[PDB]
Amino acid sequence: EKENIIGRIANLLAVGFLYSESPTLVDRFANALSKEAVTKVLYDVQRIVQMGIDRSEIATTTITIGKDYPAVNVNSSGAKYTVVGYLPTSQDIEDFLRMIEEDVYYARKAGALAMSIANRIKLGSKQSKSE
Amino acid sequence: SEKENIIGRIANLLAVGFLYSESPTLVDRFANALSKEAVTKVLYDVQRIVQMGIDRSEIATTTITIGKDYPAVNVNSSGAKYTVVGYLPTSQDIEDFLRMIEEDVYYARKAGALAMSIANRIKLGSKQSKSEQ
Amino acid sequence: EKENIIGRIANLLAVGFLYSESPTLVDRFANALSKEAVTKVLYDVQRIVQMGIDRSEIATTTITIGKDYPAVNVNSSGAKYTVVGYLPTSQDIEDFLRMIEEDVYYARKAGALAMSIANRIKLGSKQSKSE
Amino acid sequence: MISGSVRFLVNLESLNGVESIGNLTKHRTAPVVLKTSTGYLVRYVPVISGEALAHAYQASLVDIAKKEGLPVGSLSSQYEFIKFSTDEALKIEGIKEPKDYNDARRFEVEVMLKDVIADVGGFMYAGGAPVRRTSRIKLGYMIPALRGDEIPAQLEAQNVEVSSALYTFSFELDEDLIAVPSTFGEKVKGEEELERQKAKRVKSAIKALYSLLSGNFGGKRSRFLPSMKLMSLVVTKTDFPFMPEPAHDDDYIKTTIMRLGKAKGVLNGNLAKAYVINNEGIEVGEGVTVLSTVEDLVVKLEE
Amino acid sequence: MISGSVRFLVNLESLNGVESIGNLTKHRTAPVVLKTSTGYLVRYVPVISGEALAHAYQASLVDIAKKEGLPVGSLSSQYEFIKFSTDEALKIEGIKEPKDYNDARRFEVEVMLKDVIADVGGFMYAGGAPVRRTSRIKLGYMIPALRGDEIPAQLEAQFHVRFSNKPVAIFNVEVSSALYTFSFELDEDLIAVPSTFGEKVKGEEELERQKAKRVKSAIKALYSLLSGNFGGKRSRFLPSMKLMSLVVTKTDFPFMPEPAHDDDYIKTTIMRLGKAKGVLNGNLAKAYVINNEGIEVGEGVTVLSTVEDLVVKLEE
Amino acid sequence: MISGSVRFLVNLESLNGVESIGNLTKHRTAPVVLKTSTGYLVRYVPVISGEALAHAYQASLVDIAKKEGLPVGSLSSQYEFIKFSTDEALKIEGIKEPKDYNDARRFEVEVMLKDVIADVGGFMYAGGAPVRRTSRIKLGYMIPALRGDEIPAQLEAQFHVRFSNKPVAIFNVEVSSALYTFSFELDEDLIAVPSTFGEKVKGEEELERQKAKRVKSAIKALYSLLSGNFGGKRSRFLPSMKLMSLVVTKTDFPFMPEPAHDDDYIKTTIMRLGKAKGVLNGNLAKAYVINNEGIEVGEGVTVLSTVEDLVVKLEE
DNA sequence: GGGGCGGGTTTTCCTCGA
């Protein structure tokens, strides 16, 4: 369940990064040495995602990868991205903050996963444009 | 085995990062790692170097005929051209590799040894072709 | 092709021994009873060779022995040595490790060849200094 | 050396903006540590960067130099202070890159004869033969006074953020190094022109401070023009290193005057003068010249 | 000896830098172990290295020596303190390398009569006959006070852009605010005195003549450190500094004042100084205290107002 | 005997060094076995060797002896403690080597009347008739407290550059921060007493006369160790030290206080001291405690404030 | 709009005796 929480936080960070086109929040999250820095990023990334939701540029969907998987569609600057997985719940944020209060290592783990998701999606999108 | 394929793809990532940066420092850190922290830090830093090479169009995926087409990565560094044969790791390969490291840090040494072998063979071949020309 | 791989591994061990002036890695290789010991030596010897390459004290060359043969020049402590042959490729290391996973005997064979190369070169270098 | 501390009173201004989130423009804020009877508190307070002040000062210097006749660079003629950093700027200006260390001085002199801004404000060249010239004018962030147990600063939203506060800031300027090469080496042709123009360059640099001391800086002045007013100002002219006390405590003129006297006593100084402008009726002391406006201060400094 | 403990309050600060990642300039950070009511904890806090303080002190000493006529080395005339470590420096200055051990003293004297910086801050020469000279001024890292359960320090990042009419220019700078504390030690009884053991060598008379001036210059050079003239990035990030507490002790025997971590560190160090003078059979022990925060001091203690008065008293 | 346990808190520290790799200077590290709720684990933690502490103690003893008029050896006058191991030292000092076993005592006395360092810290001579003298002061490695499941220690590397106007200058330094603990033992009842068995030899009367002064100097020399004057790299990496807990026991029988690893190690050692005095038929057992962290102490225990008071009480 | 450059360490000692 700890890995599932970390994976859902990583999906939130990856969606926020792909939508904003800025690594700054993921950099802040992966370099955090206090609960203050982690919590500030968790707010700021959700505030970016909230704007994308209100603009209908961020939406939940299902995608067939032959069973349907939960996904998040992100439209940014005319690029379309799809992140596979769920976004964190309020309980996931609270349980993740409790994990951070024990060990800030979990912020680095979530940041490393988020950057991996974003890099793979950006590479695939650039390859399809070149073809 | 799927574990060997993951290790081989991590070794390709480390070799691409080494050839592009011209620095062994990340491979040295990876092969000497005694904790998951050191391994994960190198996996980020090498991918960050590869990301810059991708954005500059100095790192690109390609196919090469060695008579079937094999996946490869072209690397341009300091006017030298290198070609690493194989795939780069997926996000799932990084995650499964980190789980292997959480069980046994030996797999970081195995990937580092393979990465240095790939880089050494490519550097030797590139120096020989320059001496002949 | 197995003998060619073993010969290229023996050349790597001989170059590492002549450059480091230490038999310790060849001793470890020839006494190996596990893939762990063999793989550790293959890394450590290549790490020594990498330092010699960066210092330009180890270089590939050709030598006429009337056709040109591939060779490796080694400069150590003001002594000059020349090992005749190629260094192993990444594929040779991988195929050699597969041979070791079947039978650790091949590490003893490569170690015996490496020590023979190094001994012949050291004897010739001492004779020329005495003359 | 000319050092100074100044206190301003600003109401309903938005002069420096930072990264915007959604449809809201954010004012710059920084943390500060404040001492109270109960202990220490960490408070977030609006601030203004010093780079904007430097930009305004350099723009005023460019305008004054162009009006006078001193040389100005091609790019610097436009309000784009990239200076001689990249090869493109050198190509546009038409200056050969340095060859080795021995030639560095020459290169510097050349640049120093083509742009007054590159002289007063310094510059940096990165490459095979890097070159440097530290700025002759030093500024810092603008922070409200951290006096008492209450910070007299407010910030609100209107979306646009608008603030109000009692700001304070200090500045330094060394006029003894203007029109002087900062690299060690044999003399090269062209230094005579620099010696000739030293006086004019120094006068222009001194004059340029009027813009900052008057309140001509910051952005968003088209629709959010602020209402500024000067309250307290201290300026010191010496021949040795010195720095007046920050304008945080109510009594910082007397302390700086006493410290100036004792510093002249200790450091074997020869010249030490102080000018004070007071409008809030705070303690001053004795043996100090009292002015009425900033123009008189500028005239006296020039004289 | 002169031993001092100083407390400073600095806001919106960036004087020390480390390796940069991407477009972000980072501030030096170090781990600290702190005691709370629940036990002991480990935290990461911004710090400032002591090498910057040493460089500032040596530059001020160079300026004072040049103003007062004392000799200054050719390379040390420019603010590059390589001293006499490598052979290139010796060739530039023009001093022959030592031949054997017995000649080492001579070499030291030759180094000591040309640059005051080598005399005060020490130097090293590596070779067949290595020569060592320990610095006569000792400093340390600048650490904020570890008082209570909350560390009074904070670090953040700031956003900056460069204007251009033809976009084709964005960076971040780390800024910290804290209440720093640091201590220093300076033994003036060994200035202008050779350290290598050996026989008498011609040229010591000049050192004896110049000893008083060298000691006076070394004492004067502390004004820059006590005032706040150190660190980098002062062109656009000039910090706001304010002295809060200062203790200075002059003794004829080794002594170390208490670190400025607790609110009561003046009474304790004065009592310890008295008892140490009693127990170690000393003959001189004086203390000076500058207080601006209204904390407990004690009785029978000289109280000053500024730092210049302290410098004058130390010189006299 | 005098047996002590001391706890220190040190931040941004590098006093002990080991072999260097590349441009990196490394800090000494050792393995430790620690007990957690899940069992037993092995960790690698920075440590400080006891030889540096012994060198600092011996240097302070040399200074005190020279100040008080006690004899000091020629080689030991310079801070080089080779003592009388080799024949070159004997030739320099001017002491004839022992002839047979029966003469060994005489040689010991000749060594013992010239250098207090040989008397206190012991010495060795190897040859036809070897002579041994065990040190009267015993120290150990400085290890951080192994309390709880998390070790309160940290180690990192720092980046430094050397400025030069003509690049053709980069190094790294290891810095640690921890809460160190260490114990020491000193038996003052055997100072100025020959150890080799034999017959009476002329010159013991002078030793009996000087015994009191030697004991006083040996007791005084502990002030440097208890204050924090030890280790290297103090010129640019001066550490911040602060005493937290100290226990000192004076007994007429062998005794060892509990190590400073657990939060409750004063009550336990006091109870053990009482029971040991009861069971071993002793006649003297005194304890002194210095506490600054508010941990449990006990009842009927003398409480001090500083270290100088402890030194004075031990001397009296 | 996803920075650039110059630096990646130099000596000295490698056990003595029964």
Output the 3-class SS for chain A: CHHHHHHHHHHHHHHHHHHHCCCHHHHHHHCCCCHHHHHHHHHHHHHHHHHHHHCCCEEEEEEECCCEEEEEEEEECCEEEEEECCCCCHHHHHHHHHHHHHCCHHHHHHHHHHHHHHHHHHHHHHHHHHC
Place of tokens 């791989």: C5
- Cβ neighbours of residue F235 closer than 8 Å, sequence gap 6 or more: E122, E134, E135, E137, E138, E139
Distance C8 CA to G13 C1' (A): 40
* d(CA A13, nearest CA chain D) in Å: 16
Contact indicator for D256, D234 with CB cutoff of 8 Å: yes
**Which nucleotide is at minimal CA–C1' distance from F132?**
G17
Q: Which residues contact E313 (CB under 8 A, 6 or more apart)?
A: E288, E304
**Closest nucleotide to E170, Cα to C1':** G1
| A23, A28, A33 member nearest E44 (Cβ) | A33
* Interface contact A57, partner D, CB < 8 A: no
Closest Cα in chain C to B84:
C90
Q: Which amino acid is at C22?
A: S
Which residues are CB-neighbours of D154 under 8 A, at least 6 positions away? D163, D164, D165
Phi then psi for B50, rounded to 5 degrees?
-60, -40
Mutate which: F11, F149, F213, vs E, most E CBs within 10 A? F11
End-to-end CA distance of chain D: 15
Q: Is A13 on the interface with D (CB under 8 A)?
A: no
Angle at the Cα of D280 (from D277 to D285), degrees rounded to 5? 60
- Among C67, C80, C93, CA closest to C11: C93
Q: Does any strand G atom come closer than 7 Å to the Cβ of E21?
A: no
Angle at D73 between CA D67 and CA D77, to 5 degrees: 55
Q: Is the dihedral of CA F88, F90, F91, F93 positive or negative?
A: positive
- Provide the total of helices (H) and of strands (E) in chain F, helices listed first: 9, 14
Residue the block writes with tokens 């910290």? E176
CA-based nearest residue to C22, from C77, C60, C83: C77
The answer to whether the C-beta of E167 is closer than 7 A to strand G is yes
Smallest Cβ distance to E40: which of F152, F164, F234?
Answer: F152
Which nucleotides along chain G are within 7 A of a protein C-beta?
A: 1-12, 16-18
Are there at least 3 beta-carbon pairs closer than 8 Å between C and E? no
What are the backbone dihedrals phi and psi of residue E35, each rounded to the nearest 5 degrees, phi first? -100, 125
F110 φψ region: left (φ > 0), alpha (ψ -120 to 50), beta (else): alpha
Contacts of F21 (CB under 8 A, 6+ apart): none
The structure tokens listed for E159 are 């956003």
Give the nearest chain E residue to A40 (CA atoms).
Answer: E156
CA distances from A87 to A9, A71, A84, D39 (A): 7, 9, 10, 42
Whether residue C43 and residue B112 make contact (CB cut-off 8 A), yes or no, is: yes
Strand G lies under 7 A from the Cβ of residue F303: no
- Residues of B (33-72) placing their beta carbon closer than 7 angstroms to any atom of strand G are 52, 55-56
Neighbours of chain C (3+ CB pairs under 8 A): B
Can you give the length of chain E in residues?
A: 316
Strand G at less than 7 A from CB of F102: no
Determine the Cα–Cα distance for residues F214 and F192; give it in Å rounded to an integer. Answer: 7
Separation of F18 CA and G7 C1' (Å): 25
Rounded to a whole number of angstroms, the distance between the first and last alpha carbons of chain F is 15
Helix axes B2-21, B36-55, angle to 10 degrees: 60
Length of chain D: 303
Which residue do the tokens 């980072």 mark? Answer: E26
> Using an 8 Å Cβ cutoff, are F25 and F155 in contact?
no
CB contact under 8 A, E240 and D143: yes
Name the β-bridge partners of F174. Answer: F157
**Which residue has tokens 């209402």?**
D227
Q: Which of residues 81-100 of E touch strand G (CB under 7 A)?
A: 85-86
Using the CA of E168, give the nucleotide whose C1' is nearest: G1
Through-space separation of residue C88 CA and nucleotide G18 C1' in angstroms: 54
The packing angle between helices D101-114 and D191-214, to 10°, is 60
Q: What is the CA radius of gyration of chain F?
A: 22
User: Of the candidates E141, E184, E254, which has its C-beta nearest F12's C-beta?
Assistant: E141
Inter-axis angle of helices A90-102 and A2-20, nearest 10: 110
Rounded-to-10 torsion of CA B14, B17, B19, B20? 170
Closest among E180, E244, E233 to E45, alpha carbons compared: E180
B121–C39: do the CB atoms touch at under 8 Å? no
Nearest CB neighbour to F154, from listed E42, E82, E143: E42
| Cα distance between residue E251 and residue E257, in whole Å | 11
Q: Residues E132, E135, E138, CA angle at the centre, nearest 5°? A: 145
Instruction: Output the distance from E23 CA to G4 C1' rounded to whole Å.
Output: 12
- d(CA E252, CA E277) in angstroms, rounded, equals 9
Query: Is nucleic acid strand G under 7 Å from E130's C-beta?
Result: yes
Q: 3-class DSSP state for residue F70?
A: coil
**E166 C-beta less than 7 Å away from strand G:** no
Angle at the Cα of D241 (from D236 to D246), degrees rounded to 5?
55
The strand G neighbours among F residues 23-82, by Cβ under 7 Å, are 23-25
Which approach determined this entry? Answer: cryo-EM
Alpha-carbon distance of D170 to D2, in angstroms, equals 11
Distance CA F313, CA D182 (A): 63
Amino acid at E295: I
Q: Please tell me the distance from the alpha carbon of residue A58 to that of residue A75, in angstroms, as a whole number.
A: 7
Neighbors of chain D with 3 or more C-beta pairs under 8 Å? A, E, F
CA distance D159 to B112: 53
D119 neighbors D109 (Cβ within 8 angstroms): no
A29 CB neighbours in chain B (<8 A) are none
Nucleotide nearest residue A22, measured CA to C1': G2
Report CB contact under 8 Å: E311, D266: yes
Look at E242 and D263 and tell me if their CB atoms are within 8 Å.
Answer: no
Q: How far apart are CA D279 and CA D294, in angstroms?
A: 12
Determine the protein residue whose CA lies at the shortest distance from the C1' of G17: F126
F166 touches strand G (CB under 7 A): no
Closest residue to G4 (CA, C1′): D126
What single letter denotes the amino acid at residue B15?
A: A
> Where does residue A91 rank: exposed (0-12), middle (13-18), buried (19+ CB within 10 A)?
exposed
Please judge whether F11 and E32 are an interchain contact, meaning their C-beta atoms are less than 8 angstroms apart.
Answer: yes
Q: Is the distance from CB of B63 to CB of B72 less than 8 angstroms? A: yes
CA torsion, points D7, D9, D12, D16, in degrees to nearest 10? -10
